[PDB]
């Protein structure tokens, strides 16, 4: 189907003081992040989204509010994942019918599953959903560790295409990378996008892309091109930007930064507490410094 | 009201293949708590009731059956907890509404939530329901540890009555109990009943009460009054039970251990997997040698 | 030959600014453990006693001042354990010599050395040494965690006789127990001594029962009494004494209320800094309440 | 003095039955890998020389036979780390006079120092050493963790001219090039090469250039030059043979690839165990198609 490597925003989403989704601020991040940051796609209701605070109407508002703010040619994963199997297989049914190019699926977490319960998660989904699936792995918030040997069993599957690679160890990218490499792998830690793209990724998905996608487009072509040097630069600059936000708290930190742009950013999702005042000064002096 | 010490069966819930629920094998399990297992009170919708797993309406329909299913002389508290603090507060108002004693919240997760994003979740449930909380504690599944200067913060306020103690440290539940005197201590793990009553709890909620309730309450009497090898030789007894039930798949073990009395205790909800019949003759060495 | 049961001290040692021992103070530690603390022999050379921060004549040192300085009636357990096995076995033949009742050697740690190494290097230590061998087991240190099936294959060679087990789950603590109910088990969390002894341990090691050892007989023998309630109130105050000193970094700071008794406790061993005076206020509030 | 960037091999150190160092092997195994494997320097001592498996005779022997081995010109790095901060220091004395180019310590481990205790061990040693030190961090062996706070500290100090940073984190990394620009940074991670020349780091030890150091010329070489998808399947390469060394135990499998050349590579200490021989067809099948 659709090219699906690239470049994508995480996108995030605008609250209301009632954690209700503000549709008009949504539809601006979503262009903001096309259109402004000049990026290839969008992630949607993935972590960054606070997606995993919302209920099923709210998931099912953001997949269409972000769907309709995009031109055709932008490339769409919805991210469906969910404790409740049923509930995950009703979203992904719900974008698959609204024209998403593929579906992620964080893995199971809170319980301890183990590989089998996790592996025919992803294989009940795909059954019911006919759609492109994308491993969605993040250790660093579920505790769950994918191997070789599973990452094998998974892509065995056809139409489990590639992986959200949201892990820091490049011991174990690089295995994926040569032990698969028909499959999709999109890194998600921004921080190491340079070090991501020499690894061989096929793009990268990520929230701080919102406030600073052309940096990281730089970042992508300039390895691959082999000026590497001005890569890791603009990678310095960056991870200036992420360590900044990563200290404020990086969901209303980065919709705050959207905020000084005209775009009604709203709040985050309770118990996530608005943007703490006492960062605004360090704040304005990073958009300054970076011209965010 | 009632006064909430005592002995609970963490509910679990019998589904079918569709992943909903049994109301009237949920009501039979209900049943063999309280009256065969002679237990003082249900803990609805906690981790054991396969809760995370199940949807808004489905909670619902969980801690109706529930007290219906019990009379007036049995204690009943809420687990609402959610990553959607709107659901918990829905879930909170309507567990009151249907006259349970009191609630508890699992500590938000999943996101690296701070201590005071944390703190303000119960303040809001409280503030919103008028009903009790106890603090459901459970680092090994939410990778939240609380110390005892946040729970002094927790218990300076009036509503917040106790804990669900479901951390393994004999050193922080001794301070734990010292500090607060005065406040209610329900431990979590089954498998160290004997230490914890020693420890001067006021009772404890377990998944394994369900099938060993009995020898629970002998556990916990006899310990109170210095019989403390017979009180261990019965834990020494109930952890062999334990060990064997974790090691085949808790939940589905412990169910189809009461499908053995002729409860219809169902089916795991998805992506848990069914009992597998290889550890079948290994269960029934142990319902036979336990007399289960 | 000697029973090995009972309550020990784990030898503190004496240094001077140089990290030479002061063989005058240590031997006062020494008999101030037996005479004055009243407890049944010293563990020497264990973690509390700076050990892993020696040299070999060092070691020797210790082990010879401490055998000296009690009565044939003391009981005396050499740690010997190093991550040199040669060194290990040269202390080994050295402490039987001198008539230590017992070995113990910590699991082989730093490395990620398999089971089968660690196995093989306690089995080499008494093929070298011919004396009786206590298992040092203290995972919060090593790393290192031993399942209930390796104890098995180390509880099968007949000169391992028990564990020093300094380990806080008392699940694990309780299989033990049900599986080799003729081994020595010493328990090693000062601040759980109570729940450790309705356990069924058969004595306990603790660093702080150099300052803290007639409660610690106390909460032990009430225990055994079935005098529960008066046994944990004891550990109450006992753990007041066991935070605070943790609080305060624990070696310098228990030196530090031996010193107060008249004990030429001298210094910590760099790289640890001695007792920080910013404490000396609260220290003497907790000598002062608990009469140390 | 000497410009210490560059390649280094971590040299592996031959053992006899006894524990004993093979000296004969021992520089065979240097000239291997100074000329054949071409590599620019000796890091000696270090944790693949099974230095903290060795009294304080050996680690001299190991120095002096080292250094006698191989030429004027070979960079020589000396690890004097040890948890005896006086064996440090004898070691530090030992190897600056022997005519080694730098120091360097391992964080000190087992014991929870607090970080001024570790940041005051290193400037202890250089206070009576003199000579240069290179920070030694091992996170996965040690459980010590160094913020960029913390390493800015330990930068402040002139002696102190870089870090072998043998932890997995590219954005730690990438923040410690940032900040400290005119510090010698080593990587420690053979796997993560490529990431660590594209990171800027000023060179690498490590173990398994000792078998496939001509393969880590090209990837530092190729990296730098802009060369970077050749210098990736380099990586490719050589993860195959560190993947493979470690899934039959490093140490051993590595001299036993030494030996294969014709190298009285010898034996590990124990601890560990030899090479197991049901691991020999796979290991010469490893040496057949990487020509080692």
Redesign the interface.
Known sequence: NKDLKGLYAALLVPFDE??QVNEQGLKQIAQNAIETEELDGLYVNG?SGEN?????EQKKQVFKVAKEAVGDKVKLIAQVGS?????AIELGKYATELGYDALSAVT???????F???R??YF?IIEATQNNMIIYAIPD???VNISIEQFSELFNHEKIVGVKYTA????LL??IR?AFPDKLILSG?D??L??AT???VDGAIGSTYNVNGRRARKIFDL?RQ???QE??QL??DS?DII?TVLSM?IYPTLKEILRHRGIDAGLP?????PFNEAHRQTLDQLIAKYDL
Not at 83 to 87: A, G, S, V, W, Y
Not at 108 to 114: D, E, S
Request: net charge negative; charged share 25%.
């Open positions: 009632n954690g972590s995993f605070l919302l209920n099923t404790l409740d199997l049923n509930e199971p977490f809170y319980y301890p599953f183990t089998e319960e996790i025919d998660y009940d918030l579920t505790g820091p160890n490049f011991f690089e295995r040569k830690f921080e190491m340079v070090q020499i690894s061989g390895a082999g000026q590497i890569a890791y990678q310095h991870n360590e708290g999702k309770r118990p996530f507490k």
